[PDB]
Amino acid sequence: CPLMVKVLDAVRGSPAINVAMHVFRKAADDTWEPFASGKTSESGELHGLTTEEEFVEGIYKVEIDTKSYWKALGISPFHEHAEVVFTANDSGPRRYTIAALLSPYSYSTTAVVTNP
Amino acid sequence: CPLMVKVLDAVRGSPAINVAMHVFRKAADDTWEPFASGKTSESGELHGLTTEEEFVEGIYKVEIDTKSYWKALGISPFHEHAEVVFTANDSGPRRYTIAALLSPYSYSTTAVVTN
Amino acid sequence: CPLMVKVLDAVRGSPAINVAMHVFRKAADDTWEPFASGKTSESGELHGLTTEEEFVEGIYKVEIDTKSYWKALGISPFHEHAEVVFTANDSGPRRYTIAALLSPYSYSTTAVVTN
Amino acid sequence: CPLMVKVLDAVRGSPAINVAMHVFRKAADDTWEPFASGKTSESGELHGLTTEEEFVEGIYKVEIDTKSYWKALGISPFHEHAEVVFTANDSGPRRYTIAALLSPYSYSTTAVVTNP
Numbered sequence A, D: 001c002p003l004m005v006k007v008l009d010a011v012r013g014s015p016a017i018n019v020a021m022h023v024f025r026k027a028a029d030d031t032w033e034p035f036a037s038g039k040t041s042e043s044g045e046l047h048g049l050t051t052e053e054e055f056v057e058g059i060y061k062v063e064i065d066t067k068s069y070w071k072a073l074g075i076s077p078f079h080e081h082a083e084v085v086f087t088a089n090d091s092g093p094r095r096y097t098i099a100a101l102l103s104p105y106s107y108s109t110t111a112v113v114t115n116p
Numbered sequence B, C: 001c002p003l004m005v006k007v008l009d010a011v012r013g014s015p016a017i018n019v020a021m022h023v024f025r026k027a028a029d030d031t032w033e034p035f036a037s038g039k040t041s042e043s044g045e046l047h048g049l050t051t052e053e054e055f056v057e058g059i060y061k062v063e064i065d066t067k068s069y070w071k072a073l074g075i076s077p078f079h080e081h082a083e084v085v086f087t088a089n090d091s092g093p094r095r096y097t098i099a100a101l102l103s104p105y106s107y108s109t110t111a112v113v114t115n
Helices: A066-072 B066-072 C066-072 D066-072
Strands: A003-009 A020-026 A032-039 A058-064 A082-088 A095-103 A106-114 B003-009 B020-026 B032-039 B058-064 B082-088 B095-103 B106-114 C003-009 C020-026 C032-039 C058-064 C082-088 C095-103 C106-114 D003-009 D020-026 D032-039 D058-064 D082-088 D095-103 D106-114
Touching (some): A003 A058, A066 A095, A082 A106, A082 B082, B066 B095, B082 B095, B082 B106, C066 C095, C082 C095, C082 C106, C082 D082, D003 D058, D066 D095, D082 D106
Parallel strands (some): A003 A095, B003 B095
Antiparallel strands (some): A020 A032, A020 A058, A058 A082, A095 A106, A106 B106, B020 B032, B058 B082, B095 B106, C020 C032, C058 C082, C095 C106, C106 D106, D020 D032, D020 D058, D058 D082, D095 D106
């Protein structure tokens, strides 16, 4: 699994479940092409977005729909979404774990990059 | 000053100086329109991006060039940039302070909204 | 002002007002000695904790009463408090700003050390 | 496993490996009694600190030796340690995952609390 995303809720102290996210890859013309999408599980994780063969070198963007998540909980949050834009596999193939911690007016994102 | 951005460096424990950022506003046609830009001062702050008259309700994006910042320091970063996308809403008088804390492989952002 | 503490609320997007905190200094016998204390202002800041003459090198602890803050807001928190333990070191003139960002189940702290 | 700790390094984008930590429990006289300790694995995790029978209600403190971690990497960090002080199992038994993200001048801690 080359790309995994984990989302946590800092208000409830729990995984952020059923959070939608969309992954895009930058094309040669500088436009964002849809690449993959899914929703976090009961553990706040989203696995299986891509495969080693499909996840080629490039610039990727993960847009996490945090606004719909907070709205479902009765909160009007500050951000429209939480994101990560990064270059993947430019110095060889890697496994990427993107972790996001959510609050109504704040978010943090971190990456764990390991050699397969 | 209705919009202020402050950027901190979690590696050096200091303000993040000379960090470039661009602000965009989403137009009725769903496109991002350039709105303002600048670079952080010696205090890690960027003031004067907009005025009360110009800063109307809408969806705004602040793209912070974190990658060039880390490259200038000789540190290999993860993110291409740090985005902050938010709706500006009139609900009494409001001023927005966007604070970003930067690390090579992580960033955090918060908003302080005051009256 | 050699030591300043700023506290922000990530749920309300505002300064964290009337937050109590106690500062301790580790003495030669390994015990924690009370050093200073106060409550954050309407701007979420606590200034005037110490002076340049009093703030010598040593190991200091700032215990922020986050639990009472969340309880006052009717939100069930995780942490009893947020500690910040650090060494103050003379390496040219220095001023310390401790910034804490609070959520019910999480907190972040950073230091901005300037000359 | 009622208590698990995960530590990440925000400078290298990796798990924080071989990080020492000590867990204390507050006694009736308000003093901190040593409870458990260990070091994070190659995955930045520390499992098996306690058992369901031993992990009774109380106030606990996890002190993570972040200073020795940064010093081993050639960095003189700001904090002496990263910590979490919390009341455990006061409203029934729970499983606690403490996550810490480390930078030389900053740290973040979050808890994921789930019902067994």
